[PDB]
Symmetry: C2
Subunit: 103 residues, 2 copies
């Protein structure tokens, strides 16, 4: 169907991620590969974000609007310099439109 | 004064039973994971639309004279410990993570 997203986005598989921020606001290293019960996986992250810069289809003469990137949190083997551990880390997941009254 | 076009609720969820994997098949998701003798709940950060239409209908702040609109969910892929039938494996599964407005050019 000829359906359009209000904000345009880009999705990509990320396999070379080296750093991230966890759910507690801490910066961490993200490992390239993980050992889970004697299986070896690469850490891939499916990331979606706005393209470089208002929103589309907006009733403009009553609203200001911009496109912004929102996130999810995804478990990952990480290292903070003190402890190697699985932690939930912030990942870009969508491009969404935000409104404000024009005045 | 920032307003969201489509309102969201995000929730940490550990009671998933079924999920759709990246190849389309339904699978059962295990409630717990054992990774090198550490045992975790298999949490997912899951987002839903609150209302299909926060405004009159469709999405908020939309030019309804030219557009049909509706708030729907989009998904990411998270690796998860799953059971397809009797085979238990790590698979990428679909997890909703945002509510976005979808536009449709109104009928002629
Ligand atoms: Cl949106």
């Amino acid at each position: 169907r000829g359906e359009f997203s209000v904000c345009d986005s880009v999705s990509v598989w990320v396999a070379d991620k080296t750093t991230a921020t966890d759910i507690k606001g801490k910066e961490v290293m993200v490992l390239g590969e993980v050992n889970i019960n004697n299986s070896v996986f690469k850490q891939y992250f499916f990331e979606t974000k706005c393209r470089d810069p208002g929103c589309r289809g907006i009733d403009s003469k009553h609203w200001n609007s911009y496109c912004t990137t929102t996130h999810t949190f995804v478990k990952a083997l990480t290292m903070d310099g003190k402890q190697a551990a699985w932690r939930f880390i912030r990942i870009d997941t969508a491009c969404v439109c935000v409104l404000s009254k024009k005045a």
